[PDB]
């Protein structure tokens, strides 16, 4: 009834789509197990990009490592470890890493959006 695990030990999946390059995803608590919402951990490589998109669901994010550039419907904002991010449903968002070291963030969404 309880899972306790090192996130690093969860296998990181390379993500590659027309909008996503240089990103890896770990599914910590996935759709199958989740009553309501899922927990993922993203790694963005230097120069990596999750380009602007809208989703039907909100995001709740916590920046774990590095300087995360957040793309908005207009412009961008770079934040760092210790910031949280709440993206309303339907809002344009994306992410980039302009730095020379990997950026990591925790990302939770309602399970309707889980892989």
91 near Cu ion (CB under 5 A): yes
Query: Least distance from C-beta 22 to Cu ion, angstroms?
Result: 16
User: CA-to-CA distance for 78 and 96, rounded, in angstroms?
Assistant: 9
What is the closest distance, in whole angstroms, from the C-beta atom of residue 9 to its own copies in the complex? 9
Nearest to 53 by CA among 12, 103, 95, 85: 95
**Binding window for its own copies (CB under 8 A); candidates: 17-25, 42-50, 88-96:** 88-96
Residue 57 contact partner, candidates its own copies, Cu ion, none, CB within 5 to 8 A by sort of partner? its own copies
Q: Choose the contact partner of 55 out of its own copies, Cu ion, none; CB within 5 to 8 A by kind.
A: Cu ion
């Amino acid at each position: 009834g309880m899972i306790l695990k090192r996130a690093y030990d969860v296998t990181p999946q390379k993500i590659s789509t027309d909008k996503v390059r240089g990103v890896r995803k770990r599914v910590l608590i996935g759709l199958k197990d989740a009553p309501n919402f899922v927990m993922r951990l993203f790694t963005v490589e230097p120069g990596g990009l999750c380009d602007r998109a809208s989703a039907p669901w909100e995001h709740e994010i916590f920046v774990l490592k590095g300087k995360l550039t957040v793309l908005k419907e207009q412009g961008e904002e770079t934040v760092e470890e210790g910031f949280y991010i709440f993206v309303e449903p339907n809002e344009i968002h994306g992410f980039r890493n302009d730095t020379d070291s990997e950026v990591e963030f925790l990302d939770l969404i309602p399970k309707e959006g889980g892989e």
